Amino acid sequence: TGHKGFSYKLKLGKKIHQNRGVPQWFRMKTGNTINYNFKRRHWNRRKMGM
Amino acid sequence: FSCTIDLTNCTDFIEPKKLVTFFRQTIKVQGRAGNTKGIEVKVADKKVTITTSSAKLCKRYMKYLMKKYLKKNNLREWLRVISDKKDGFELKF
Amino acid sequence: PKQVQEFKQILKLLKSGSIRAVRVKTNGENTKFKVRCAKYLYTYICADKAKAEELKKAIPKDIHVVEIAKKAP
Amino acid sequence: AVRVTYVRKHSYNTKSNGIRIVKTAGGNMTVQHRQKISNGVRCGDCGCVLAGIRHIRPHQYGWLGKSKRTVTRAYGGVKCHKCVQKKILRAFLINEHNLIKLAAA
RNA sequence: CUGUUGCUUAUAGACGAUGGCAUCAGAAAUCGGUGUUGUAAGCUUUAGAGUUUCUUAAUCAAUACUCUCGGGUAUUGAAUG
RNA sequence: AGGAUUGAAAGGGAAUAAGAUUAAUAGUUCUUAAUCAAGAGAAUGGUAACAUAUCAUGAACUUUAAAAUGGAGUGUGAAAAUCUACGGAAGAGUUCUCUUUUCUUCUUAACAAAAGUAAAUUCCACUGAAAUGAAUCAAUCAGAGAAGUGGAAUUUAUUGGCUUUGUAAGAAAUUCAAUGAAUUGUGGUAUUUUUGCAGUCUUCAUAAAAAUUAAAGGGAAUCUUUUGCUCGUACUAAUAACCGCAACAGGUCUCCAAGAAGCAAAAUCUUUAGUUAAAUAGAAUAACGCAGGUAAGGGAAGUCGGCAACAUAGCUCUGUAAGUUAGCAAGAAAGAGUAGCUCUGGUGAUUAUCGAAUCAGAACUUUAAAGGUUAGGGG
Numbered sequence: 152t153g154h155k156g157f158s159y160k161l162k163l164g165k166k167i168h169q170n171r172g173v174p175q176w177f178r179m180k181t182g183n184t185i186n187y188n189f190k191r192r193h194w195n196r197r198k199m200g201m
Numbered sequence: 202f203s204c205t206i207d208l209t210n211c212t213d214f215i216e217p218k219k220l221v222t223f224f225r226q227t228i229k230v231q232g233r234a235g236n237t238k239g240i241e242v243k244v245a246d247k248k249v250t251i252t253t254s255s256a257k258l259c260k261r262y263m264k265y266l267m268k269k270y271l272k273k274n275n276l277r278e279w280l281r282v283i284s285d286k287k288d289g290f291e292l293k294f
Numbered sequence: 295p296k297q298v299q300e301f302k303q304i305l306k307l308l309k310s311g312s313i314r315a316v317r318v319k320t321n322g323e324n325t326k327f328k329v330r331c332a333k334y335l336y337t338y339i340c341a342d343k344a345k346a347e348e349l350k351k352a353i354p355k356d357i358h359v360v361e362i363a364k365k366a367p
Numbered sequence: 368a369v370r371v372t373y374v375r376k377h378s379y380n381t382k383s384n385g386i387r388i389v390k391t392a393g394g395n396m397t398v399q400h401r402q403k404i405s406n407g408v409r410c411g412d413c414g415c416v417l418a419g420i421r422h423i424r425p426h427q428y429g430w431l432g433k434s435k436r437t438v439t440r441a442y443g444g445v446k447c448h449k450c451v452q453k454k455i456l457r458a459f460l461i462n463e464h465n466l467i468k469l470a471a472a
Numbered sequence: 473c474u475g476u477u478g479c480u481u482a483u484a485g486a487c488g489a490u491g492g493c494a495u496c497a498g499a500a501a502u503c504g505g506u507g508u509u510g511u512a513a514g515c516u517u518u519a520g521a522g523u524u525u526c527u528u529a530a531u532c533a534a535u536a537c538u539c540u541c542g543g544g545u546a547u548u549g550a551a552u553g
Numbered sequence: 554a555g556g557a558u559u560g561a562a563a564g565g566g567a568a569u570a571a572g573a574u575u576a577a578u579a580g581u582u583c584u585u586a587a588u589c590a591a592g593a594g595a596a597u598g599g600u601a602a603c604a605u606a607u608c609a610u611g612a613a614c615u616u617u618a619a620a621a622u623g624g625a626g627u628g629u630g631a632a633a634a635u636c637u638a639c640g641g642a643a644g645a646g647u648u649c650u651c652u653u654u655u656c657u658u659c660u661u662a663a664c665a666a667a668a669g670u671a672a673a674u675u676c677c678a679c680u681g682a683a684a685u686g687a688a689u690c691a692a693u694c695a696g697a698g699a700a701g702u703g704g705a706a707u708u709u710a711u712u713g714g715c716u717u718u719g720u721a722a723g724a725a726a727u728u729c730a731a732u733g734a735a736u737u738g739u740g741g742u743a744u745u746u747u748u749g750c751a752g753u754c755u756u757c758a759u760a761a762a763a764a765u766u767a768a769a770g771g772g773a774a775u776c777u778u779u780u781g782c783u784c785g786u787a788c789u790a791a792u793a794a795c796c797g798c799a800a801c802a803g804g805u806c807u808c809c810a811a812g813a814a815g816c817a818a819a820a821u822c823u824u825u826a827g828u829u830a831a832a833u834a835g836a837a838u839a840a841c842g843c844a845g846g847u848a849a850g851g852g853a854a855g856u857c858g859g860c861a862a863c864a865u866a867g868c869u870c871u872g873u874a875a876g877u878u879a880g881c882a883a884g885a886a887a888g889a890g891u892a893g894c895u896c897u898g899g900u901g902a903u904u905a906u907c908g909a910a911u912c913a914g915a916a917c918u919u920u921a922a923a924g925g926u927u928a929g930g931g932g
Contacts, residue, residue: 155785
């Protein structure tokens with residue numbers, strides 16, 4: 152909604168912050184298997200239930 | 202009521218004398234054409250004036266006939282009637 | 295904004311120390327002396343040029359006076 | 368015809384959400400929030416609306432002049448002038464009767 | 473030789489097929505014939521009940537007369553050139 | 554002194570508006586103009602109703618009022634919108650056929666002032682109504698006092714309702730020129746919406762409370778300046794942002810709301826705004842389909858069954874049965890009229906001019922007229 156509580160907005164901001172990918176430099180480390188963030192979601196693909 | 206036409210740049214394209222014969226035969230004072238006896242257009246030398254007070258005339262009427270006249274000779278495309286903010290009308294390209 | 299009605303209210307207004315800014319507007323007919331005070335913007339509509347000049351004589355010298363005309367400042 | 372929108376975030380035509388459409392420069396119409404209609408004072412006895420007191424919100428009487436919220440009379444602002452005349456007659460006539468009834472009848 | 477292809481191909485046809493012509497090919501307009509509807513637009517009969525205005529002078533007026541057997545359409549699956 | 558906590562971003566509530574600005578926020582920023590709260594520096598007037606930029610002291614205690622109260626329907630004040638009359642200014646469209654023509658703009662906030670001036674209700678003073686008066690669309694009222702005259706008060710989207718004024722033309726809109734110049738009257742016995750007001754009707758229904766504020770009874774006591782904290786604020790709000798597994802023809806609460814035409818917020822067409830893409834196209838124009846139609850003569854013979862389709866359909870006038878709980882049946886059934894053009898009369902206001910769409914009538918002409926859309930089959 153337009154109106155939201157203070158704590159609820161910060162938990163909304165963190166969900167925005169965690170919807171990012173692996174930085175390129177992290178992918179060039181030796182013996183690295185993490186290429187994509189499998190905890191990714193999109194607004195029109197999955198609702199985050201909060 | 203006095204209305205002047207400023208041909209100070211396009212006097213060649215529209216010589217004043219042709220306006221007077223056309224104007225004085227066209228204004229419908231009371232529904233007829235050419236019965237403009239109470240209209241004193243005169244020569245006005247450089248310009249063309251009307252300066253008539255006896256009959257019911259309007260400045261917006263003057264722009265109407267001139268735009269009709271510009272369509273009569275098919276030279277409305279080049280010219281353009283623009284008021285001078287001085288109870289008159291002047292023509293621009 | 296408040297409108298003063300006669301001269302003696304605006305002569306008294308100017309000679310007090312509470313003035314903050316004066317703007318003079320010239321119109322087609324009248325002249326408005328919008329004295330800006332701390333709270334309101336008092337104005338006086340005068341119709342005589344001679345009376346308008348007298349007001350400019352009484353204006354203090356430490357106060358800023360703005361003249362407004364057909365073109366905005 | 369210029370159509371307008373609610374300025375605040377209220378979206379329902381409640382009593383407190385009354386609006387008036389006024390015109391502004393250039394042909395634009397804006398939205399004004401208009402006040403509710405209040406009731407005036409009433410006589411404590413006959414329940415008739417008193418004269419000389421305006422019908423404004425209760426907090427607005429604080430902004431009113433001290434003489435514009437009461438009438439200069441005994442029981443002014445709480446009783447009609449008829450509500451008070453009968454009070455005086457009751458106070459006087461009954462006391463007179465109790466002086467002849469008791470006290471050496 | 474046969475097939476593709478072209479005539480936005482027909483006497484044929486869901487698609488294939490089938491039938492015709494392919495440089496004297498083909499197509500297209502225009503013209504005449506042949507049909508359909510019903511007399512175009514402009515000016516004229518005061519056509520014209522009345523109104524109106526100058527006061528027989530005009531107007532405005534549904535509809536009606538002559539130009540007008542007009543005008544418009546006509547292969548698109550019509551026929552000549 | 555009296556009863557604890559929570560419970561509403563649609564209930565109550567101190568106070569902000571206009572213009573501009575951003576690639577995106579704006580009653581929040583900027584300019585200008587205000588408001589509110591908390592502070593800091595023992596009175597007169599009027600017969601009376603009641604009235605005086607703070608004024609003009611008012612403790613404990615008690616009371617009263619406000620916040621704070623259904624719905625229907627009728628009349629009416631005012632504003633806006635639409636329409637229209639007069640007077641112009643500026644620009645655009647049409648112009649071989651005419652058109653003094655058609656179209657666009659002509660604006661103004663919060664908060665305050667008080668030149669001019671309204672409608673309605675309730676009270677006050679004088680006098681006392683019958684030959685009863687007064688008044689509304691309807692009503693309704695009067696010797697616990699009508700009508701008349703003269704007054705007071707409140708309401709009418711902020712001060713005080715409308716015009717007007719400060720704000721405020723310096724803004725904004727429409728034009729012209731290459732930043733700078735031009736104008737921004739007055740009306741209406743028209744319609745709709747909104748907003749109040751006035752009485753009427755209706756209920757075995759009577760249609761919230763507190764925070765908070767003011768006043769009274771009582772007599773205890775003797776203009777300038779500062780601050781205004783925390784949090785929400787982007788965007789969609791839906792034939793693509795929500796719920797249905799999805800860019801699902803399903804579902805989901807509201808606000809603002811133009812012209813024509815008509816009884817109508819109906820069907821149909823257009824203006825401001827939005828969009829031309831919203832699970833791909835092209836060619837051919839077979840059968841069988843889905844959707845919309847028509848038909849010679851007959852007219853339900855089809856079928857379980859008039860299923861489906863056809864048919865009647867608006868308005869005006871005449872006329873209308875049996876039966877009946879006497880209210881209805883009833884738009885019973887049935888019959889006639891309806892177009893275009895040119896005219897005539899009726900229905901008002903001010904003292905001849907001005908305006909309202911409505912009703913009736915008469916000639917003439919035609920393709921003989923509700924039927925483009927909308928629109929009861931009957932017994």
